[PDB]
């Protein structure tokens, strides 16, 4: 909304630069960028009062190149990525370099990986509501699952007659490993959507779940047999059913 | 580095309350208080002294007494999620973040009907689903890494105002079936297994 951080999800080989933008609110001139851990720690890394820069630290300083250019969007990018830069990278636009209120973007989380070869999309598929359901209770559950992913950075949405719903949808909060004892293992999520047992036996009403992955870019190379592994969008559908 | 939150976790029943506190070891000028749901970190409060109120949540702040509180009333489903203060310590000027709670909000099932439900894809393959238990039961992983089981996930029907929890579980295996799909979970003794 009022911070618009792109992407929301990377994925890089070691070596490689990545590269996150930043467009701050509106009227608010000071742009934080912090990198969040996995225990929920908020590291500091630099900020800038239009283009210039007002704090940061040594390693934002070495590690990585930030501006923020006039009339365009701020952007950080680590100049060669290592493992140890995966993280949530969050920018926070505010009035002033202190005492005032920050408002955050959806961060972009980036994975540093030694090989773009185990990246993978999903495959999705939908199941059907079950009759038992729906003689049960007279609701009827549709579930998505998403499979074969890697990295796990995708974004799940149902869509009904064309339009994104959120009402009675749930979607598990982390995807799971297919081989959880196994590094580099693909994952798995799956998402329920659940409708009166009316509105799934309307024939005329239409159902689709949605995954966004993110992956390889243009720029990408792939010499590998199988297609490139890019950003792209998946989905599985199923159209409703009479008795 | 950090705030001192607590609590650390917290689950709460819909419809109930409480407070998350965070003690300061030195004089601060404001703190913030947000939220986050994968979702963004969403701003609820920001003060310097006294209190605010927006709905369900207050906040207060006493810089002197170095503490603040959120308080959640008749807490929703909706209010799930990690919260965190944020304070600028007078003496660096600079922000510090709380360590975090976990907030879990419970939904109330009226009617549990603990069920598991064979579904079939859309275009041989099938899940299985275990639904309408009540939030007193709980959903174990499997031991063989051959079948996967999702932790449970609370939906919200809001034109039925209707709440209900379900995990998934699906195999390859040939030795797969609904009926022991979910053997590795104590589910209810009056759980319904169709056909």
């Known amino acids: 909304m009022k911070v618009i951080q792109t992407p929301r999800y990377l994925v890089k080989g070691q070596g490689q630069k990545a590269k996150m933008r930043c467009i701050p609110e509106?009227?608010?001139?000071?742009v934080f960028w912090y990198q969040q851990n996995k225990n929920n720690e908020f590291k500091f890394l630099i900020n800038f009062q239009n283009q210039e820069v007002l704090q940061q630290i040594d390693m934002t300083e070495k590690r990585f190149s930030a501006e923020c250019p006039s009339n365009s969007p701020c952007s950080l990018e680590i100049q060669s990525s290592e493992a140890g830069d995966s993280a949530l990278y969050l920018c926070?636009?505010?009035?002033?370099?202190?005492?005032?209120?920050?408002?955050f973007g959806s961060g972009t989380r980036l994975l540093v990986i030694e090989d773009l070869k185990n990246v993978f999309p999903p495959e999705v598929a939908v199941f059907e509501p079950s009759e038992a359901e729906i003689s049960h209770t007279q609701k009827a559950t549709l579930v998505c699952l998403a499979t074969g992913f890697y990295p796990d950075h995708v974004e799940l949405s149902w869509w009904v007659n064309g339009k994104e719903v959120h009402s009675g949808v749930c979607t598990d909060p982390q995807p799971l490993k297919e081989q959880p004892a196994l590094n580099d293992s693909r994952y798995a999520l799956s998402s329920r959507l659940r409708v009166s047992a009316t509105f799934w036996q309307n024939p005329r009403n239409h159902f689709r779940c949605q995954v966004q992955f993110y992956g390889l870019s243009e720029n990408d190379e792939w010499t590998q047999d199988r297609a490139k592994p890019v950003t792209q969008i998946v989905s599985a559908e199923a159209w409703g059913r009479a008795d | 580095d950090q705030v001192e939150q607590s609590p650390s976790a917290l689950s709460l029943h819909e419809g109930t309350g409480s407070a998350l506190r965070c003690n300061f070891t030195?004089?601060?000028?404001?703190v913030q208080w947000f939220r986050k749901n994968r979702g963004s970190l969403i701003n609820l409060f920001y003060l310097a002294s006294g209190t605010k109120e927006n709905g369900r949540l207050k906040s207060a702040f006493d810089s002197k007494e170095r503490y603040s509180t959120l308080h959640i009333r008749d807490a929703q489903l909706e209010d799930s999620g990690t919260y965190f203060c944020a304070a600028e310590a007078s003496n660096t000027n600079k922000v510090v973040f709380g360590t975090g709670t976990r907030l879990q909000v419970l939904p109330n099932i009226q009617n549990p009907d603990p069920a598991v439900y064979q579904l079939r894809d859309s275009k041989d393959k099938s899940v299985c689903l275990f639904t309408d238990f009540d939030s007193q039961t709980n959903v174990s992983q499997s031991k063989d890494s051959d079948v996967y089981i999702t932790d449970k996930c609370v939906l919200d029907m809001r034109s039925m105002d209707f709440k209900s929890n379900s995990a998934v579980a699906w195999s390859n295996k040939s030795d797969f079936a609904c009926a022991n799909a979910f053997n590795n979970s104590i589910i209810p003794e009056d759980t319904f297994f169709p056909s």
């Open positions: 926070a636009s505010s009035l002033n370099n202190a005492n005032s209120d920050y408002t």
């Open positions: 509106k009227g608010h001139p000071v």
């Open positions: 030195t004089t601060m000028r404001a």
